Amino acid sequence: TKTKIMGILNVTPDSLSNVESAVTRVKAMMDEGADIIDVGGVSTRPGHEMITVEEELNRVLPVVEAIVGFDVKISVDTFRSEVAEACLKLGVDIINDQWAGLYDHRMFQVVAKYDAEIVLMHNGNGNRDEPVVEEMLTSLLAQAHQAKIAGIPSNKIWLDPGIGFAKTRNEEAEVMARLDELVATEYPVLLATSRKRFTKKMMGYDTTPVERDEVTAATTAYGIMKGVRAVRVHNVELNAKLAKGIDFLKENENAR
Numbered sequence: 195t196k197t198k199i200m201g202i203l204n205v206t207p208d209s210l211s212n213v214e215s216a217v218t219r220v221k222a223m224m225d226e227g228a229d230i231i232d233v234g235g236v237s238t239r240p241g242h243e244m245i246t247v248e249e250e251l252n253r254v255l256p257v258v259e260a261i262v263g264f265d266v267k268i269s270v271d272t273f274r275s276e277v278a279e280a281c282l283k284l285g286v287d288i289i290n291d292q293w294a295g296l297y298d299h300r301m302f303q304v305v306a307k308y309d310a311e312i313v314l315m316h317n318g319n320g321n322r323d324e325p326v327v328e329e330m331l332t333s334l335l336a337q338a339h340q341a342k343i344a345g346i347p348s349n350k351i352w353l354d355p356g357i358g359f360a361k362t363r364n365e366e367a368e369v370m371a372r373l374d375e376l377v378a379t380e381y382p383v384l385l386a387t388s389r390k391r392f393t394k395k396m397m398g399y400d401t402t403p404v405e406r407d408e409v410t411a412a413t414t415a416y417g418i419m420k421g422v423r424a425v426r427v428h429n430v431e432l433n434a435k436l437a438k439g440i441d442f443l444k445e446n447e448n449a450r
């Protein structure tokens with residue numbers, strides 16, 4: 195089918211980016227073509243301090259509670275089962291786990307409990323004994339099997355290469371050049387490179403985040419041609435409109 199467009203909603207201020215004002219943005223995102231709304235309030239980067247579970251729920255639930263009643267799939271960016279279960283009780287559809295269940299292994303039992311979808315992102319401290327691609331596939335496939343043991347079917351298990359996590363710009367380029375190997379897993383692949391430092395290397399010069407939406411859409415079109423099924427972007431309108439063109443051209447070539 196179509197490539198799902200996952201919009202970013204950051205609860206907190208962020209360098210790359212109120213309840214009533216958040217709902218206004220959520221309504222704007224779907225009009226720009228957002229298929230999924232990823233609500234996040236955490237960051238697994240080393241340049242941050244981990245916040246308590248109670249603080250995280252005070253961040254996501256006021257916005258989630260308002261938006262669960264819309265005609266859109268809702269994704270929650272969290273790696274702690276207590277936060278995901280609380281959102282799953284409200285009726286969210288996707289749990290975006292940045293640690294792929296490594297931080298909290300109860301995430302698989304909770305997501306499978308509510309018959310929901312889970313995103314498994316490749317992450318780490320940056321150390322590995324094998325090449326980044328082989329290490330990424332080894333780590334993700336092991337976590338993907340753990341979700342299937344819990345009862346989650348393969349269609350509902352998403353794989354994210356984790357661009358910007360435990361990788362250098364050279365290791366990120368090695369992953370982006372071999373995206374077909376990650377799609378060969380037959381799991382739906384989610385690509386998230388919106389306004390990231392990888393994007394900065396594509397232009398070759400120092401830029402602000404908002405001027406990296408064009409090269410972000412380039413990764414979107416390139417990813418769809420490789421076989422990815424969803425993209426996590428900031429600029430929904432540019433990527434959702436561009437993805438529809440690539441999906442149109444890919445379906446047109448397959449039909450003819």
Ligand SMILES: Cc1noc(NS(=O)(=O)c2ccc(NCc3cnc4nc(N)[nH]c(=O)c4n3)cc2)c1C
Pocket residue numbers: 209234239271290292313315354356357358359384386387389390391392426
């Ligand atoms: C400062 C500064 N200048 O550029 C950057 N960009 S970056 O280092 O590559 C960078 C690194 C990490 C993040 N985390 C943001 C983030 C949050 N949730 C995600 N969920 C999924 N499934 N996949 C993702 O990729 C993902 N990324 C965002 C940006 C920063 C940070």
